[PDB]
Amino acid sequence: TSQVRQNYHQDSEAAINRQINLELYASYVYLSMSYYFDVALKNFAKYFLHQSHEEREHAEKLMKLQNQRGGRIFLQDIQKPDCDDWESGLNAMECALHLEKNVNQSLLELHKLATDKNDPHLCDFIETHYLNEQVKAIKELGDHVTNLRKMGAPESGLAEYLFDKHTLG
Amino acid sequence: TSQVRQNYHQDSEAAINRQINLELYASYVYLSMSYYFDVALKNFAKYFLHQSHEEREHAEKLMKLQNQRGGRIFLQDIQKPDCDDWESGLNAMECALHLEKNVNQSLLELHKLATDKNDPHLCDFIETHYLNEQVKAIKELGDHVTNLRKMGAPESGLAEYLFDKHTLG
Amino acid sequence: TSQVRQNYHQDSEAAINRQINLELYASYVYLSMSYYFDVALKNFAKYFLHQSHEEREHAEKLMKLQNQRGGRIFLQDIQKPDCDDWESGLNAMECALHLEKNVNQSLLELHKLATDKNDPHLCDFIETHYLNEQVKAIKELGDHVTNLRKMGAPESGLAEYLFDKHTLG
Amino acid sequence: TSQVRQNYHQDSEAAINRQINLELYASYVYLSMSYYFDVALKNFAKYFLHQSHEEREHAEKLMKLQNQRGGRIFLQDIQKPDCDDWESGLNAMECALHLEKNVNQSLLELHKLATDKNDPHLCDFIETHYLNEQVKAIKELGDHVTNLRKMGAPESGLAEYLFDKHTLG
Amino acid sequence: TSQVRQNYHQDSEAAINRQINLELYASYVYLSMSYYFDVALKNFAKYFLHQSHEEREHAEKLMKLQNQRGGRIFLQDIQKPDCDDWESGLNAMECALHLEKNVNQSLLELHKLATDKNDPHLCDFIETHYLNEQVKAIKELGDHVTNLRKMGAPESGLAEYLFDKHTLG
Amino acid sequence: TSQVRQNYHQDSEAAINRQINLELYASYVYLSMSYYFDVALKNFAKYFLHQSHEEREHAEKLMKLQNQRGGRIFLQDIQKPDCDDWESGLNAMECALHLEKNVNQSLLELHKLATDKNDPHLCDFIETHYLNEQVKAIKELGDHVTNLRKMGAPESGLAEYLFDKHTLG
Ligand SMILES: [Ca+2]
Ligand SMILES: [Ca+2]
Ligand SMILES: [Ca+2]
Ligand SMILES: [Ca+2]
Ligand SMILES: [Ca+2]
Ligand SMILES: [Ca+2]
Ligand SMILES: [Cl-]
Ligand SMILES: [Cl-]
Ligand SMILES: [Cl-]
Ligand SMILES: [Cl-]
Ligand SMILES: [Cl-]
Ligand SMILES: [Cl-]
Ligand SMILES: [Cl-]
Ligand SMILES: [Cl-]
Ligand SMILES: [Cl-]
Ligand SMILES: [Cl-]
Ligand SMILES: [Cl-]
Ligand SMILES: [Cl-]
Ligand SMILES: [Fe+3]
Ligand SMILES: [Fe+3]
Ligand SMILES: [Fe+3]
Ligand SMILES: [Fe+3]
Ligand SMILES: [Fe+3]
Ligand SMILES: [Fe+3]
Ligand SMILES: [Fe+3]
Ligand SMILES: [Fe+3]
Ligand SMILES: [Fe+3]
Ligand SMILES: [Fe+3]
Ligand SMILES: [Fe+3]
Ligand SMILES: [Fe+3]
Ligand SMILES: [Mg+2]
Ligand SMILES: [Mg+2]
Ligand SMILES: [Mg+2]
Ligand SMILES: [Mg+2]
Ligand SMILES: [Mg+2]
Ligand SMILES: [Mg+2]
Ligand SMILES: [Mg+2]
Ligand SMILES: [Mg+2]
Ligand SMILES: [Mg+2]
Ligand SMILES: [Mg+2]
Ligand SMILES: [Mg+2]
Ligand SMILES: [Mg+2]
Ligand SMILES: [Mg+2]
Ligand SMILES: [Mg+2]
């Protein structure tokens, strides 16, 4: 019986909890990728490690909004990364691109729900903190995927090495 | 077929992977506790949030050793926190004490395995980075549990509030 | 009924208490030596006074570990220095050498006990804080004893005076 | 056959040696108290640890006067703390108050002896370095004992905790 | 007849002397490699020259422990580098990887001997100063070997040149 | 088939390689002496350790000239120190004096060869970097040998100790 809860639909509360789990999952995927490239693509490793920290801040801010609006946080298992054993740095970038577009669709479904329930604070929260960061991340990974393919990856040995030094350096 | 792997038993590699999952689980438990105390015990929240960051560094360093020794990281689901809905800040401290002693026993089993396989580098790694941090953490949580009980928790309203301001401030 | 005690054998607890008393005794021996050389070897006095402070920190850290592991500190009488009335600064160095090698054997017995009880944290604690400091101290006192004998002590009047100014200055 | 000894009675020399042992004993009592309060009253611990260092400086200065006046230092066993297992921080303060008043009576007996032997330098030494420090220490411990009783110790759980934070912080 | 020697087996003393010669040999191998790459891979040259200085510090610290524990240093011929005339920078990295893993096995045999003779100070010395440095060095050379092969070495003319500028720059 | 080699006789190339081995041998002799005086003449130890570093720079610069002139470096075993077990610091100085004069004769034979082959660059290199350093080193060791004998070494216990503090301090 929250004395602070106001105009916060239970469907929105449940969907925020599902988004929290998805952000944590994305953090887990990036942590997997980071530690995977320990041998020869160590700037890929630090790119994905930074991506991993960002995803956990994404989850923590949704956990904070759940408390702010008077909801109840409900956590679930953080599934281990679906994609794994990437044969190259390019394949990891492709999976991250796929991941971020899946997360973007989740955020767009969240916004549509907030719109349907007439929750302008929740729509503003999604737009201010997550919608443009998603567009930027998808654009960045799209740039990386396309550039690496043009450079000659994944066949070329120098392509991923040089991309590691110059683009992710 | 690792060219760097040397004196690294597959039982040790598997046990390191299980320890990685346990450290991540401990990080998840502390993140749950941190966000739980958003109302009235906000220094409990920052204590547990700091504990959460420490557990993830614990996991990342074990992931780094897995690569260093020529092993293969194998990740599993991060189970959601077993304990939940703590009725007070003291109960969260009791569960963290229980958690850390369970983690300590895991680390002691790890060391016994490393001793049995005559892996002095792995024994040194466990002793240098994890065994004393565990003793310190168990001692700290033990101090917090005992102090809060003496102060009159969990019945006393002022006890947890003042402990929040003075001990965890 | 310690809630923090874990893998801490009562034999180890008792042996830590005996080591505490031995470290305090060593501090008492050095304090005796320091105040003994007030007349003509005042840099011997400050060497032994510094040695005395170090031994008390040795005891305080063992007292801290006793609490950390959930043991109970049990103090005993600090026996007055066995050796006394040293006829020269060299004889005091010989007794300190004898003392430190006796303390080293105690620490090696402590480690063997910790090894027998499979207490890797206690083995690490002894190795990290006390085993190399003991080797260094025995080497230093051995150097001082040998050097003073070569210089012509204890018969030579200038030998101990110059050693006081140059080696311990 | 001291060429520096002048107007220094052998009764005074023996009584200085007994005072040295008493100061060391007081240092041992405070060290015991300091390490005793490791759990919940850690500012009591640092108060008593500081008291312990002060008592050892008290002993070292009496050892220095013994040499200054041409006497011979004679050390004895440092008895382990009589009082122990204090049920609260207040009980430790009561024992320290009892201890300091016993030490004060010793210092007053010392002064009466110095007066009887017409040793104005020894009377000045006792008055300058020890008589007012004793009055201050007895007053301080008396204040702490009375304040803690008024606050509701030892029954009140908050009393000793808050006194630890505010008075001894 | 060392007055400082304590719990130091003659087998350990002899094995330390053999390790000293091996560390000096490793320093000689790296000095050979450094001066070998004077033409076109001058950052390989400075990588191996730095490796060479490190190996001599490795030897000097073992010589210091031999004195510390009361042993006697016995030096032998420093054999000229076995491997030589490396056809590429990659082949030099492969020989250094082979060398470091041979040195690691020597250090692990040393530790097993120290364990058998119950010398915890010598086990700590090996673990603290040499076991993790060996794991790091083997991992680094393993990374370099694998990366250079992927880049296209040794056939590719640009591969070793760019690796020289970016990885070893 | 060196495109840079010009006016560089193969006899000079071979003699440079022999000089390289001799400089490394001299470095090994000084390293032996340094670690030998760990007990009572620790400024002798640092004098010889500095001498040892200088000899290795002597060897590295000859290795660099071998590459500069288009020659091929050929390394041989670094023989363990001929002289050993010096009974005093003076005897170590006498052996170093003997060593440096043997090295000087080698450098003078090298110069005569360079003169016979009309290699003015090699004559300049020997004169600029090695001939005066040799005269200075022989003069210094000659001074040390003579001074220590006059002071009363090796019989006098104070002589080597004071020389250690004042001349080599
Ligand atoms: Ca908006
Ligand atoms: Ca270790
Ligand atoms: Ca250790
Ligand atoms: Ca006065
Ligand atoms: Ca150790
Ligand atoms: Ca010239
Ligand atoms: Cl939900
Ligand atoms: Cl995570
Ligand atoms: Cl596994
Ligand atoms: Cl996490
Ligand atoms: Cl006991
Ligand atoms: Cl003491
Ligand atoms: Cl007396
Ligand atoms: Cl004390
Ligand atoms: Cl040997
Ligand atoms: Cl070398
Ligand atoms: Cl040759
Ligand atoms: Cl060398
Ligand atoms: Fe991102
Ligand atoms: Fe996100
Ligand atoms: Fe922690
Ligand atoms: Fe942990
Ligand atoms: Fe010491
Ligand atoms: Fe000690
Ligand atoms: Fe006091
Ligand atoms: Fe006092
Ligand atoms: Fe190295
Ligand atoms: Fe090495
Ligand atoms: Fe020189
Ligand atoms: Fe030279
Ligand atoms: Mg699954
Ligand atoms: Mg915006
Ligand atoms: Mg489940
Ligand atoms: Mg061990
Ligand atoms: Mg440690
Ligand atoms: Mg007795
Ligand atoms: Mg150490
Ligand atoms: Mg008694
Ligand atoms: Mg006054
Ligand atoms: Mg050979
Ligand atoms: Mg280490
Ligand atoms: Mg030979
Ligand atoms: Mg000329
Ligand atoms: Mg010149």
Short mmCIF file of N, CA and C in Angstrom, two decimals, chain B residues 139 143 146-147 150-151 156 158-159 162-163 166-167, chain D residues 38-42 155-158 161-162 165-166:
data_model
loop_
_atom_site.label_atom_id
_atom_site.label_comp_id
_atom_site.label_asym_id
_atom_site.label_seq_id
_atom_site.Cartn_x
_atom_site.Cartn_y
_atom_site.Cartn_z
N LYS B 139 34.21 -10.98 9.46
CA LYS B 139 34.38 -10.26 10.71
C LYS B 139 33.55 -8.98 10.73
N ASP B 143 30.48 -8.23 13.17
CA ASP B 143 30.43 -7.06 14.03
C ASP B 143 29.11 -6.32 13.87
N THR B 146 26.14 -8.35 15.45
CA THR B 146 26.16 -8.31 16.91
C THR B 146 25.82 -6.92 17.43
N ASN B 147 26.42 -5.88 16.83
CA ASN B 147 26.18 -4.52 17.29
C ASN B 147 24.70 -4.14 17.17
N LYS B 150 22.65 -5.76 19.87
CA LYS B 150 22.86 -5.11 21.17
C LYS B 150 22.14 -3.76 21.22
N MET B 151 22.13 -3.00 20.13
CA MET B 151 21.52 -1.72 20.05
C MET B 151 20.02 -1.77 20.21
N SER B 156 13.76 -1.93 17.95
CA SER B 156 13.97 -0.50 18.19
C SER B 156 13.97 0.27 16.88
N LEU B 158 14.95 3.49 16.58
CA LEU B 158 16.13 4.34 16.50
C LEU B 158 17.39 3.54 16.21
N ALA B 159 17.43 2.27 16.61
CA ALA B 159 18.67 1.50 16.54
C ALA B 159 19.21 1.43 15.11
N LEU B 162 20.15 5.01 13.73
CA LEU B 162 21.40 5.56 14.23
C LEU B 162 22.60 4.77 13.71
N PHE B 163 22.51 3.44 13.73
CA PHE B 163 23.55 2.61 13.13
C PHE B 163 23.79 3.00 11.67
N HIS B 166 25.83 6.42 11.91
CA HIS B 166 27.12 6.46 12.59
C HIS B 166 28.07 5.36 12.14
N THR B 167 27.60 4.11 12.05
CA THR B 167 28.49 3.03 11.65
C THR B 167 28.68 2.98 10.14
N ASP D 38 36.72 -5.16 20.16
CA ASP D 38 36.87 -5.20 18.76
C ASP D 38 35.58 -5.31 17.99
N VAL D 39 34.52 -5.69 18.62
CA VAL D 39 33.28 -5.95 17.97
C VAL D 39 32.39 -4.78 17.73
N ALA D 40 32.01 -4.12 18.79
CA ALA D 40 30.95 -3.12 18.75
C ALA D 40 31.35 -1.78 19.34
N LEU D 41 32.47 -1.68 20.07
CA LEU D 41 32.88 -0.44 20.72
C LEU D 41 34.33 -0.21 20.29
N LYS D 42 34.50 0.19 19.03
CA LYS D 42 35.83 0.28 18.44
C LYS D 42 36.47 1.62 18.78
N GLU D 155 22.80 -1.48 30.83
CA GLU D 155 21.58 -2.10 30.31
C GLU D 155 21.23 -1.57 28.93
N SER D 156 21.29 -0.25 28.74
CA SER D 156 20.86 0.36 27.49
C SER D 156 21.81 -0.03 26.36
N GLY D 157 21.24 -0.51 25.25
CA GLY D 157 22.06 -0.86 24.10
C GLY D 157 22.60 0.36 23.38
N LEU D 158 21.80 1.43 23.31
CA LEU D 158 22.22 2.63 22.59
C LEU D 158 23.25 3.44 23.38
N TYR D 161 26.87 2.60 22.68
CA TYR D 161 27.12 2.84 21.26
C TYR D 161 27.25 4.33 20.98
N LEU D 162 26.33 5.14 21.51
CA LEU D 162 26.36 6.57 21.26
C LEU D 162 27.54 7.23 21.97
N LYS D 165 30.47 6.86 19.91
CA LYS D 165 30.54 7.71 18.73
C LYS D 165 30.83 9.17 19.09
N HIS D 166 30.23 9.67 20.17
CA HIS D 166 30.24 11.10 20.47
C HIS D 166 31.32 11.49 21.46
#
